[PDB]
């Protein structure tokens, strides 16, 4: 599953529909990023630029011009064909091929952007620009507007109104098309396969980074070359560090390992967390904490639907957590009083859910305290966890236990669809999977 | 093999030995780098900062103060311990543990650098600073010097002399210690294992990126988590693009694949290229080009030694290439006349060798046209290639063939040591390796 | 005559009337400007900031908040009272006195602008800001918007729309109130007195700068401390340099001197040019050129009125100039053909008229080729000139003659009022004035 | 008196003598400065650039190249001849005339500085540059060094050492040549004439700014077009504000007026302060404070000589002040105890002396607490004052009195020469001068 030229075009048209007549929208590509000295990190296109183009080159700018309420057109600035640059660094789309390939009306060399952009903006009323997104982009836009402002003797005029298109575009991104959901479903499947593999490969004495290696290889083999975020493999006390990425320790017989990893497939993020015993068998203490986190996740998965909110579901999770922690003696007191005091916060200190899409922490307005009412087409994670610090003032057997279990879901008309349920999470199923693997 | 605290300390002392009395050297850590939105790329420390510290955190500055010719000391600015930041993002060394861990005299919070740095520079004659390396660093240094310049009523004075330490430090880096050579030897071995694996796994119909996946998994399993540069897997006509990294094509029965890949092990780069038939058997045309490139590499490996130069060895390679291309009818004319006209350049358009170390294209002065005389302790690549474009005006059977073969060597008292000869390169050995793998 | 608190308030209200509900307008003071080392030029407030405040301090920001269509208020950020800063550098208005003195609702310390501005902008739909006017202002505004954009977890939101208020404000400035016209009338009178003085003081052997001295002293004595632009005193060939300000030459018996000078009175510019003989008597050649320029000015003064344009009046002037130059043999050919070829341009190369107000080249849209139809309340200069270069291919007696004659006018319902006719311009009146002075 | 081409050349040579072999010094002109909108302040050349050139244009850079210990040469970058720019804005020296006019070896267009500067710096060991002086200059220098650093394949190399030339140049400026002393002597005479005029013109009911007008006219008539700093005319309580420049009040019968004003003559500053009765007669209270300030000045003038210091002379002044204030009942207690407590500081809160030259607060190292031993050729002010605030807890008759009396001196072999004693300061002489003027 992928996103096609025609869908990128529909998105551009949907933006144009929202624009004022006599306006232009400017969407800039991500800069290349140095890793060390003359070597660069693998290129990652800006998500908003990607959303409107599917074009994976730097030094590119999409310009959507809405001349009036019926007439509009698109111009792409992009790198020119250049034999020498291409022999060295790779092929470039260039200007001749771009209109047909991408479905834009005109393409111009990026090297000419300062000579041409002001001409496209001249006489317009409004420019849509994400001010502050990139320095290089602000320089280009500010230079063009200055030429126009100062050019009255050449009959030039600048648009007086600049509107940030991020709020409009991020609201578009928040609601996925069926094609996007299909891509995210595949990302979920690929990510789940990787997590199953990690559980099947894990043995005491392996390093945390070995499981990262297994996961990344699995992503690759299905065509997801890069992860969507830096993979977390936190064994033992490291599982109590939320975004632990050092992954440098030897995994010990008797510890849990928490793996938070997700692929990037056609631009879209998977995001799964599983926690499991390094030796294939939960201890009693580990199981007691795990059961609370799993009940939190299972309850959330029953509840998420149009018309509820992340805030509302979080309330149910907090009750499950406080109730369970009281039963184990980790918290002491009356459940309702403890809930009123947010007594769970030392052990569950992050949010239950975030939006998911072209970014792992995806764009879109949450509302105050994540109170926004859910609607079909929203995609979000569900990620309860409990983290009992090595020095917590709790019964000793629970110290140093970090557990998170996370699935990705899409809100549907009828509830939600779980995109990541193909990797096991019930403790007996985890144990069975690992027992079967350990016998090979 | 690794680099130890005591070696980092010896390096700092070696720099101090070269500094003027009444001076301070300032070495800044790399900034964290955004990948998309709120997600960052995996952190890569600045190579020069790494060289003097082995410390893998951002927001850190090493200050070496040479008060006079016998008295000197070191101060590290680094991130403070912070429970909340650490629960979220990972542990920090902090100030209490840093002096013993790193072997510096004093450690101070990075948050206090603007309140403290000018106090360390006050009254010194010289500051060593890599101006222009990082914007954030220039801001800090410039602010401190301005405070001092403008602070005469508070009895403050700025050092009037600013010296770029890059030339001195890069000359240090150019000559490897035995410990560095041991690390590079392991990087070479790990990289060679990965290339052997790629040859054993390659089959027609696999995608170029599949071999990248195999290579990266092999790096990981030996403790080299990241590649030293973006892996190149160029099959067919893609092998004629020097740093092709798209790796997006299906590998065809009858094509060659060129793989240029290297691990980063304890900061140090491996860098190997092998070219081999996707189907395990070179065609006659492919073998004819391969033989010329291999003779170029084998001759270079015989010749490299103290007292020669990259320029001198390149001359021998150019003769081998022109002679071979004339024999096949790719070039026409008198060999010596063709050499005088640099007639090889359409087919071999890059350098034979680059320095190798903490960067894949490592630091250090080459001399005009890479004429610097070689000395023991220098580490360099040897990477002849021939690239016959799909549209080259040559006998048709050679069009679209891109071949490079690259080894990493260290210059010794007695010649050179090849760090990467554990992955095969003779065509009969490549074929035998692949035949054996294809039968499994 | 001056502009009062209540008028500044009416202007602020007039701007608020034009603003969208749920918006804030930000108007920043001019920075102080270094002359040399630690010495600054005399402070000149930004004209737009002045227009809305009459407040002559730096480090001040006026914020007009339009909460909805009936409710609005103003906040001033300005320097705090500070005994030491005030003993050294002068008194400051401060926060307690500002609301009553300036007629704003609230005043806050400038030192707190970064802690407070984002709070004022939070939740608004539109911010009016002159982007690119001042670097320091852009930094403040951009920082505030960034805090808001990134502050969703603190329930903060940024206005998505930024509108340049310059076009609206400059259209306000283009049409003067009766009070502004009264101030400009006084500026005209003061400037005219200075020009009369220069004519009465001029003698051969004085330096050009001596007349600048007389002019500036006259401005001062009437309470116009500073000129509105750098005074031009161009004698002989220097009169052919349009904005000659060196004023370094000894004025020669037999040369003309062109003086372009204007006061700044309560923020408003006078702008007069007179050209006259250094020795008090025009030569025949000088008179022949002078007569053409004077006829151009006199005709323009008859014609300027509501419903015509600078372009239209310029056409009449060009005909007068071409006709006169043909009669003297400076141009040769048919007048209408010469007009069609713009044959006057080597000798009259600037515009006839510019707007006049808080800036000498005042703000406001001219229309293409200065075609905008004139309306009552517009204030403009009328400044024909002829400049015959020392090396011009013309009859020799005209070479090196530079003449400009300039008056300031206000368009009225019934034509125009000349604000500067109290300094003579008829050649016989100039001669009589100088003869009378030279006899003393 | 002026500074000639040959002296500017001697200065350049004196700098070259101090430079390391294989070095270049870069000295940049001041930028033009906006006053309002498209109008600029009158141009003021950077003092250090002026010191080495006597060239009064912006967009100019002096480059002194010391190739080795016997060979050196100079290159000027400056604006090209351009007919249109010159018809509008004034004549330019250009490249053809510059070598002879200024005495430099070569001149190049400023428009070519980025194409040429790196070529001049290539292969040098040291660059002398005043980092942070001007943004535009830092951009040019940093760009050139970056081209060189990154240009090894084009055989380019950057100087690794950057030295601030300000300390060396400011030490040069601190010691005046006989020609400089002659210029400063004339500046002193011109400034003194202006102060005499102000005393002769002052009458009750005039505004403070009227005396500024008289002073500036007097500067102008002697060829000092601009003041060296903004003129201070502080009458009554305004005399207690040290750099009061509003000069907006009506001068009252019975008040003192303090005038601090100085001309700029051929680049050099005069700096005189006189305080006198607006009505021509000191009251008893005014005379009692005046006598203490005058004794302080007269004693300082007797004492200043080679081998003493500003700190040492200040000690004598503090004793005179504390002794006098005790006698009047403004201070109470034992003189030596009061001195030990710095009890004078509420009334004399600034320094006695500053260096004087191309800047009014001239360059040069003072030493801790202005302790540097004085030597012949140093030029400094002597400016005791007493300022009794309107609300001071002192006998009522002294409240609101601000008195400063300031002369400019040059240290000679034999003591000092007073450059400003031609304007009276003894109270009986002030009264006689004013009485004589008031009778006219
Ligand atoms: Cl391009
Ligand atoms: Cl910190
Ligand atoms: Cl403040
Ligand atoms: Cl130029
Ligand atoms: Mn998540
Ligand atoms: Mn996750
Ligand atoms: Mn290589
Ligand atoms: Mn390589
Ligand atoms: Mn004018
Ligand atoms: Mn004018
Ligand atoms: Mn002074
Ligand atoms: Mn003074």
Swiss-Prot record, chains A, B, C, D:
Q: Which domain of life is it from?
A: Bacteria
Q: Where does Mn(2+) 2 bind?
A: 260, 271, 406
- What is the protein's given name? Xaa-Pro aminopeptidase
A single GO BP term for this record reads: protein homotetramerization
Substrates-to-products reaction catalysed: Release of any N-terminal amino acid, including proline, that is linked to proline, even from a dipeptide or tripeptide
Which PANTHER family does the UniProt entry name for this protein? XAA-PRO AMINOPEPTIDASE 3
A molecular function (GO) held by this record is: manganese ion binding
Q: Which UniProt keywords apply?
A: Aminopeptidase, Cytoplasm, Hydrolase, Manganese, Metal-binding, Metalloprotease, Protease
- Per the UniProt record, the source organism is Escherichia coli (strain K12)
Q: Where in the cell is it found?
A: Cytoplasm
- What cofactor is this protein dependent on? Mn(2+)
Q: GO cellular-component terms in the record?
A: cytosol; protein-containing complex
Chief location of this protein within or outside the cell: cytoplasm
What binding partners and quaternary form does the record give?
Answer: Homotetramer.
Concerning InterPro entries, the annotation shows:
Aminopep_P_N, Creatin/AminoP/Spt16_N, Creatinase/aminopeptidase-like, Pept_M24, Pept_M24_MAP, Peptidase_M24B_aminopep-P_CS, X-Pro_dipept-like
Keyword Metal-binding in annotation: yes
Family classification? Belongs to the peptidase M24B family.
EC number(s) recorded for this UniProt protein: 3.4.11.9
């Amino acid at each position: 599953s992928e996103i096609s030229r025609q869908e990128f075009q529909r998105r551009r048209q949907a933006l144009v529909e929202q624009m004022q007549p006599g306006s232009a929208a400017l969407i800039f590509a991500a800069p290349e990023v140095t890793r060390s000295a003359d070597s660069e990190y693998p290129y990652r296109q800006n998500s908003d630029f990607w959303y409107f183009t599917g074009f994976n080159e730097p030094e590119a700018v999409l310009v959507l011009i809405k001349s009036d309420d019926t007439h509009n057109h698109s111009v792409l600035f992009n790198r020119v064909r250049d034999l020498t640059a291409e022999i060295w660094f790779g092929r470039r789309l260039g200007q001749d091929a771009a209109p047909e390939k991408l479905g834009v009306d005109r393409a111009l060399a990026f090297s000419e952007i300062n000579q041409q952009l002001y001409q496209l903006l001249n006489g317009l009323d409004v420019v849509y620009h994400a001010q502050g997104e990139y320095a290089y982009a602000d320089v280009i836009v500010n230079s063009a507007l200055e030429k126009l402002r100062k050019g009255s003797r050449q009959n030039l005029t600048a648009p007086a109104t600049m509107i940030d298109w991020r709020p409009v575009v991020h609201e578009m991104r928040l609601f996925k098309s069926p094609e996007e959901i299909a891509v995210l479903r595949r990302a979920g499947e690929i990510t789940a396969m990787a997590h199953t593999r990690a559980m099947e490969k894990c043995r005491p004495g392996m390093f945390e980074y070995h499981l990262e290696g297994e996961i990344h290889h699995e992503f690759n083999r299905h065509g997801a070359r890069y992860p969507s975020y830096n993979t977390i493999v936190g064994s033992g006390e490291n599982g109590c560090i939320l975004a632990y990425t050092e992954n440098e320790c030897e995994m010990r017989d008797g510890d849990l390992v928490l793996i938070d990893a997700g692929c990037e497939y056609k631009g879209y993020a998977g995001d799964i967390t599983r926690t499991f015993p390094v030796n294939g068998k939960f201890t009693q203490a580990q199981r007691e904490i795990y059961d609370i986190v799993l009940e939190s996740l299972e309850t959330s998965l029953r509840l998420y639907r149009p018309g509820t909110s992340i805030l509302e579901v979080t309330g149910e999770v907090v009750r499950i957590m406080v109730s369970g922690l009281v039963k184990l003696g980790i918290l002491k007191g009356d459940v309702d009083e403890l809930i009123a005091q947010n007594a769970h916060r030392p052990f569950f200190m992050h949010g239950l859910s975030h939006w998911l899409g072209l970014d792992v922490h995806d764009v879109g307005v949450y509302g105050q305290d994540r109170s926004r009412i859910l609607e079909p087409g929203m995609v979000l994670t569900v990620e309860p966890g409990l983290y009992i610090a090595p020095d917590a003032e709790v019964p000793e057997q629970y110290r140093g236990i970090g557990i998170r279990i996370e699935d990705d879901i899409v809100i549907t008309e009828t509830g939600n669809e779980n995109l990541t349920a193909s990797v096991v999470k019930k403790p007996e199923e985890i144990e069975a999977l690992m027992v079967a693997a350990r016998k090979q």
